[PDB]
Amino acid sequence: GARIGEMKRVTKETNVSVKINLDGTGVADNSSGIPFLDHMLDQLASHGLFDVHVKATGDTHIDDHHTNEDVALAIGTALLQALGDRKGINRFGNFSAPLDEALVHVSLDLSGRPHLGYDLNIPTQRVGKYDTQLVEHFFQSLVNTSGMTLHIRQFSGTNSHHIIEATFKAFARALRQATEYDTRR
Amino acid sequence: GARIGEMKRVTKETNVSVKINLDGTGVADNSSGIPFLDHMLDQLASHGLFDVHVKATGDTHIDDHHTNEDVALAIGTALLQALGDRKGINRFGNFSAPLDEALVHVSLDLSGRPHLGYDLNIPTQRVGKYDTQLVEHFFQSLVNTSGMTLHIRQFSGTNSHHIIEATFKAFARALRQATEYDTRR
Amino acid sequence: ARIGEMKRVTKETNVSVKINLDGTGVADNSSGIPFLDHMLDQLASHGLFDVHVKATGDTHIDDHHTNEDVALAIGTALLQALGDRKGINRFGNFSAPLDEALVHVSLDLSGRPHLGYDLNIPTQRVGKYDTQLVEHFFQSLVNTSGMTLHIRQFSGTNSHHIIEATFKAFARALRQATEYDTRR
Amino acid sequence: ARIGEMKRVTKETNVSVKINLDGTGVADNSSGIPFLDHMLDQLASHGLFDVHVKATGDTHIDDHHTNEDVALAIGTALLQALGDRKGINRFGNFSAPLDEALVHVSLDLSGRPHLGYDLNIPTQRVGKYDTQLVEHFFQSLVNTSGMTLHIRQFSGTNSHHIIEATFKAFARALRQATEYDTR
Amino acid sequence: ARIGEMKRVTKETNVSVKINLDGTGVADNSSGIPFLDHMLDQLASHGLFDVHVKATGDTHIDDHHTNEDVALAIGTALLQALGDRKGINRFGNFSAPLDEALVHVSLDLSGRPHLGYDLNIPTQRVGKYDTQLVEHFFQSLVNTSGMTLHIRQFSGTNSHHIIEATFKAFARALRQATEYDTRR
Amino acid sequence: ARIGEMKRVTKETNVSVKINLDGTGVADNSSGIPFLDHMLDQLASHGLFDVHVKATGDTHIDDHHTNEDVALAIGTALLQALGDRKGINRFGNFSAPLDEALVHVSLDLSGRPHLGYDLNIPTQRVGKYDTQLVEHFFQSLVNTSGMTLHIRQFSGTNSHHIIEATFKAFARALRQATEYDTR
Ligand SMILES: [Mn+2]
Ligand SMILES: [Mn+2]
Ligand SMILES: [Mn+2]
Ligand SMILES: [Mn+2]
Ligand SMILES: [Mn+2]
Ligand SMILES: [Mn+2]
Ligand SMILES: [Mn+2]
Ligand SMILES: [Mn+2]
Ligand SMILES: [Mn+2]
Ligand SMILES: [Mn+2]
Ligand SMILES: [Mn+2]
Ligand SMILES: [Mn+2]
C-alpha cells in the first residue's frame, strides 16, 4: 500500500492541514499562506517524489513565524504517522544537492531520536518576504515531531534563495532514499 | 479591590487608550496598530495574569516608532496609577524565561527611580514588519513613566521572535511577582 | 496524585520507572549505575517527587545504553504524569549552590524539546560514571518529556559537586514548574 | 520565634547581637561603623528579620576588627537561631537591582562554609567605610554560620549602590532560606 | 542508446568526439595529450560510457587549445546525447578515493553552467601535462554541456592521484546522473 | 555466498573469524572486548554481513593485541571472501549520523592499503575500551584486506556516538562496495 500521513492542527494562531504520501509521484499542492515556503514544499514533492498537500491560514499579519512553525510541526507528525514501524526501509538518507553556486549536503536517520545539526550560512535576512531565520526553525520543528536525526551542511553558496532551495532539494532526495524500502531486507 | 490604571493620551501623532488590571485573570485586548506589539502585549496578559487593554491609532505610515513609544508611555503611567502607594507588595520581581533556544532574565524593582539596563542581542532588524530597535524603546519609555528599575539580560538566543517573546514572558512574570502582595507584610 | 509509569524493554536494557509529581521525596533508584542512582535520589529529596527507577542493561559494554534508556523512560513518565498541564506554574527556575559549585536551571514544560547545556565538567569520570553521560541524560529526558531546559554553570571545580548541583537545581526547578498556580 | 543571641568580647571589640528569624523588620544597629549600620538596617527591612547589633571597638585603628567581630557574631547568632534547621526552605536565591547595579545572591544553609565572591567595587571608600570590608563581612559571617554563599555582580558602577544591592539580595535570599517549606 | 557526436575543426585544432551514455566502458581516446587520454579512459571504465576522442592540434605551442577544444566538444556531445533529459536521475554524487587522495564531485544536469572547483594540485606538471589545464577542462565541459559541477578535494598529496580521483568521481557521478530514475 | 574464514593463533591471541559478504545480518561476536563486540554487531546489522568473531587473548595486559589480531583476521577473511573481486561495485561511500555525530566513510577495494583517519574522539575510554584502538582496528583491517579507506568526522561530541557512527558508515560503505554492479 501507500504510506500516507495526515494531520490537522488548529491553534489560536494557526489552522493547518497536512497530507503526505511517502510513495507518491511528486504531486505538489501547497498553500501555507507563506509563498516562499510553498515554493520549498513544492521542491520537496518534485525532488522527493512525495505527494505533499499543505493548507494553512494563520496570523501572518504578526509575522510568518507561527504559521511556519505549525506547518513544520504538522509535517513532522504526518511523516511519523506515514512511517509507522519503519520496518524494512533504508532508514538513512544522504544527498549533496547543487544549485548553481550553492552546494548543501543533508544526512539523516529516521532514528526516532530528534536532533538537528544546522550549518547553513544564509547571507541575507529576507528572501522575498520570507524571514531566513525561519529555515532553521522549519527543520527544527520537523525534526521534533518526526523524531529524525538531521544534519544540514553548506559547502558552497552566496545566493540565499539558492542556498535554501538546495537545502530542500538535498533534504527531499535524502528523505526519499531513507523512506524507500531496502530490497535486501 | 482590584488595582486598575487607565490612561488616554492623544497627541498629533497618536491616539492611545490603555487599561491594565494588576489583579486580573489574563484578559488580552490589544489593538495598537502594531501587530507584533499586540502579540507581545498578549503575552504580558497571559503570563502576568494582568488584564491588558490597549487601543491605539497613529502615524504608522511614517513608521511604528511614535505609536510604539506612546503606547509604552501610556502603559507605564497606567501601571504607576494602578500601583498607588505600593504599600505591602513584593516590590521586586525576578524571572528567567526560556523560549526554545532563547533564555532572558528580567530583574526589576518598583522603586520609583527609572532605570533601564538593556542587554539583548537581537540578530535581525525586523520581526514581521516590527522594527527590532523598538523593543528597547518600548521598555525605556515604560520605565520612564512607571518609575521602575528594570534589568533585561539575554543569556541564550538566536531567533529574534524567540528572544523578544522570552523577554516579554520574563518581564510579565517578574512584574506579576513584584506587584503581588507580600503576605508577611 | 499525578503518577507516571513507563516500562521500556529493549535488547540492550530493561527499564521500569514510576514518578509521583505530588510525592513526599521517596527515593527508590537501582538503575545499575550507582552515581546516577545518587543523582536520582537528589531528584526525589530536593524535588519532593517519589522516584522509582529499576533497570538492568548491558553495562559490561559501558553505561551509555542504560543511562539513555533510563532518561528516556523518565521523560515519558514525567509527560504521562503531567497530563494536560492545566493550571500549573509551567516554568521553573533555581540556582543551586553546592560548596564552590553554582548551577542555574531554567525550564518550561512547553511541549517543545530543547536542551541548552553549559556545564564545564573538568574530569572524565566520577567514580565509574562517564561524565559525558550527564549531557546525554538531560538530552534524552528532554526528548521524551517535551521540556525546554537550560543548564548553566556559574561556578564550580569539583565534578561531583557540579553534577550534583545540577540535579539539585533541576529538581527544585522541576518542582516549581509542576506545582499548581493558585491564581490559575 | 527563632531568636539567636551572641555576646563576643575580645581585646579589640565588644559585640552584642540578637536576631529574630521570624521578625517584623525591627532595625536597631549601632556597630560603630555608620555605613555597616545602614547595611544591617537593609538586612532587617528587606529580610523582615529583627536585627539588634551593638558594638564598641578599636575603630581608631580602622574598622576592620569591629567589622570582623560583628560579622562573626551575626553568623553565630544566625546559626543558634536556626536550631535543627528542620522543615525550612534551606536554599535562598535573589537578584536585587539598585538603579544601575544588579547583584545575585544564592545560598544554602548547608553547614559547609564557602564564600564565592564576585563583586567589582570601583572605589576604595564609601563615606569612611573601607570597601575591602564587604568581602570580609560575608567571609566571617559564612565562617560562623556555616552557610554556602555565592555573590555575583551583573551590573553596577556606584559603590554604594553595588554594596547596598548586595545586602538587599542577601537579605531576601536569607529570608527565603530561613522560611518554612510548607509542603 | 543515447549517443552524442561532435566534430569541431578550428585553425588551432581538429576534434572528433562520440560518447555513448549507455555504453559498456569502451575507451578510444587519442587527443594528442597522453595524460588527458589516461583521464578520458577513466571516464569510460568508471562511468561505463563509450568514449571516442580523436584530436590533432597545435600542441607545439602548448596543450591549451587542444585541451580546451576537446573539453568543449565533449560537453556538446554529452548535451546532444542527453536529449530532453526526461526521466533521468539528473543529479550525481560520488566521493572517489585513490590512495591518499579523496575527491568529491556533485553535479546536476540542470542546463545552467557552473563550475565550483576546489582542488589543491601541488605540482605544475604531471608528465608533460600542465595541471592548470584540469580546471580549464572542466570549465569548458560545463560551458557546452550546461552542467552544474562542484569538485572538492578532501585529501591528497600526489598530483596524479588527485586528478585521477577527480575523473573517477566525475565519471561515477555522471553515470548516476545519466541513469534512468525508475520511479519517474 | 562469498564466505571468508581465518584462524590466527599467536603467543598473544587466538582468533577465529568467519564473514559472509552475502549474509543476512547474523551477529556472533565474542572477541573478549565488549565494546568491540558491540561495534562488530553494528557491522553485521548495518552491513547485512554475517559476522562471527571468537577470540581469547592477553587482555590482562590491555586490549591492544586482541584488538589488533581481530582486525588483521577480519581483513584477511574479507579479502578471501572477495575472491577475484569481479563485477562488484568496488567503491563504497556513506555518511552516517548518530545523534550529534556525523562520520563519512569512503573506500575502494583497490588492493592498495591506505588509511586516511580524521576522527576527533574527545575521551580516552568508552567503558573499558581504549579509544586509541579505533584507529588501530581500521589500520590493521586495511593492512590485511588491502583496501583504501578514508574516515572523516564532520560532527560529534560523544565518544560512543562518534565511534558507533564510524562503524555504521563503514558497514554501509562496505556493503555497497561488496555488492554486485548489475550493469
Ligand atoms: Mn517558535
Ligand atoms: Mn526557486
Ligand atoms: Mn522616540
Ligand atoms: Mn510568538
Ligand atoms: Mn546515545
Ligand atoms: Mn554527593
Ligand atoms: Mn581579618
Ligand atoms: Mn543607601
Ligand atoms: Mn582557454
Ligand atoms: Mn593513473
Ligand atoms: Mn599494535
Ligand atoms: Mn551503542
Please provide the DSSP assignment of B20-88 as one string.
EETT----EEEE-S-HHHHHHHHHHHHHHT-EEEEEEEE-TTT-SHHHHHHHHHHHHHHHHHHHTT-TT
- Residues 6+ away with beta carbon under 8 Å from B85: none
Q: Do chains D and F touch (3 or more CB pairs under 8 A)?
A: no
From the list C63, C132, C139, which residue is nearest F123 (CB)?
C132
* A115 in contact with chain B, both atoms CB, cutoff 8 A: no
CA E75, CA E5: separation in Å to the nearest integer?
Answer: 10
* A98 in contact with chain E, both atoms CB, cutoff 8 A: yes
Instruction: List the grid coordinates of B130.
Output: 516590527
| E62 contacts E132 by C-beta, under 8 angstroms | no
Candidates F119, F183, F180; CA nearest to F151 is F119
Candidates E143, E140, E120, E123; CA nearest to E131 is E123
CA distances from C86 to A13, B100, C89, C92, C183 (A): 19, 20, 9, 15, 12
| D102 contacts D165 by C-beta, under 8 angstroms | yes
Q: Do chains D and A touch (3 or more CB pairs under 8 A)?
A: no
CA E107, CA E89: separation in Å to the nearest integer?
Answer: 11
Candidates F160, F42, F44; CA nearest to F101 is F160
* A124 in contact with chain B, both atoms CB, cutoff 8 A: no
The β-bridge partners of C81 are none
Candidates E180, E183, E177; CA nearest to E91 is E177
DSSP state of F63: S
CA D64, CA D136: separation in Å to the nearest integer?
Answer: 8
Q: Coil, strand or helix: which one is A75?
A: helix
What pairing do the DSSP bridges indicate for beta strands F3-9 and E148-155? unpaired
- Residues 6+ away with beta carbon under 8 Å from D166: D96, D103, D105, D119, D134, D151, D153
First to last CA, chain C: 18
Report residues near ion ligand 12: CB below 5 Å. F 164
CA E135, CA E121: separation in Å to the nearest integer?
Answer: 10
Instruction: List the grid coordinates of C93.
Output: 527556575
Instruction: List the grid coordinates of A12.
Output: 489560536
C-beta atoms of A64 and B39 within 8 A: no
Place of cell 513544520: A72
CA E105, CA E98: separation in Å to the nearest integer?
Answer: 14
Q: Coil, strand or helix: which one is D158?
A: coil
CA A52, CA A21: separation in Å to the nearest integer?
Answer: 7
CA B92, CA D42: separation in Å to the nearest integer?
Answer: 14
What pairing do the DSSP bridges indicate for beta strands D50-57 and D13-20? antiparallel
Backbone angles phi, psi at E124, to 5 degrees: -90, -20
Instruction: List the grid coordinates of C107.
Output: 525550564
Other CB atoms within a 10 A radius of the CB of residue A118 amount to: 16
CA D24, CA D45: separation in Å to the nearest integer?
Answer: 8
Please tell me the distance between residue C115's alpha carbon and the centre of ligand 4 in angstroms: 20
What pairing do the DSSP bridges indicate for beta strands A130-131 and A102-109? unpaired
The β-bridge partners of C107 are C92, C149
CA A109, CA A151: separation in Å to the nearest integer?
Answer: 9
- Residues 6+ away with beta carbon under 8 Å from B139: B72, B116, B118, B150, B152, B171
C-beta atoms of F126 and C62 within 8 A: yes
Helices and strands, counts by H and E, chain A: 4, 10
Tell me, what amino acid is at B178? Answer: A
CA distances from A161 to A1, A95, A127, A169, E106 (A): 36, 19, 6, 12, 19
| A138 contacts A72 by C-beta, under 8 angstroms | yes
CA distances from E160 to C73, F60, F92 (A): 55, 47, 22
The β-bridge partners of A18 are A7, A54
Other CB atoms within a 10 A radius of the CB of residue B131 amount to: 17
CA B98, CA B156: separation in Å to the nearest integer?
Answer: 9
* F120 in contact with chain C, both atoms CB, cutoff 8 A: no
Burial of B45 (0-12, 13-18, 19+ CB in 10 A): buried
Please tell me the distance between residue B163's alpha carbon and the centre of ligand 1 in angstroms: 10
Tell me, what amino acid is at E12? Answer: E
Place of cell 515556503: A37
Other CB atoms within a 10 A radius of the CB of residue D180 amount to: 10
For the stretch C99-119, what's the b/e string if a residue is b when 16 or more beta carbons lie within 10 angstroms of its beta carbon? bbbbbbbbbbbbebbbbbbeb
The β-bridge partners of C19 are C4, C51
What pairing do the DSSP bridges indicate for beta strands F101-108 and F148-155? antiparallel
Q: Coil, strand or helix: which one is E111?
A: coil
CA C162, CA F135: separation in Å to the nearest integer?
Answer: 33
* C64 in contact with chain F, both atoms CB, cutoff 8 A: yes
**Helix then strand then coil, % of chain F, to nearest 5:** 35, 35, 30
| E52 contacts E108 by C-beta, under 8 angstroms | no
Candidates A103, A106, A169, A173, partner chain E, best to mutate (most E CBs within 10 A): A103
CA D93, CA C94: separation in Å to the nearest integer?
Answer: 8
CA C38, CA C45: separation in Å to the nearest integer?
Answer: 11
Backbone angles phi, psi at F51, to 5 degrees: -125, 115
Q: Coil, strand or helix: which one is A181?
A: strand
Candidates F70, F87, F105; CA nearest to F21 is F87
Q: Do chains A and C touch (3 or more CB pairs under 8 A)?
A: yes
CA E174, CA F4: separation in Å to the nearest integer?
Answer: 34
Q: How was this structure determined?
A: X-ray
Instruction: List the grid coordinates of A11.
Output: 491553534
Instruction: List the grid coordinates of B8.
Output: 488616554
Half-sphere exposure of D74 (CA within 13 A, CB side): 30
Candidates B147, B90, B92; CA nearest to D165 is B92
| Chains touching chain F, criterion 3+ CB pairs below 8 Å | A, C, E
Instruction: List the grid coordinates of C5.
Output: 509509569
CA distances from E78 to A99, E31, E107 (A): 20, 17, 14
Place of cell 534551606: D90
Other CB atoms within a 10 A radius of the CB of residue E136 amount to: 17
C-beta atoms of D148 and C97 within 8 A: yes
C-beta atoms of C112 and B100 within 8 A: yes
Residues written for chain F: 183
Backbone angles phi, psi at D93, to 5 degrees: -140, 135
Please tell me the distance between residue A32's alpha carbon and the centre of ligand 3 in angstroms: 37
Candidates D5, D69, D6; CA nearest to D32 is D69
Sheet strands side by side (includes D50-57): D3-9, D13-20, D50-57, D27-30
| Chains touching chain E, criterion 3+ CB pairs below 8 Å | A, F
Which chain C residue's Cα is nearest to B105? C106
Q: Dihedral sign for Cα A86, A90, A96, A100, please.
A: negative
- Residues 6+ away with beta carbon under 8 Å from A133: A125, B123, B124, B158, B159, B160, B161
C-beta atoms of E183 and A49 within 8 A: yes
The β-bridge partners of D125 are D130
CA C184, CA D128: separation in Å to the nearest integer?
Answer: 51
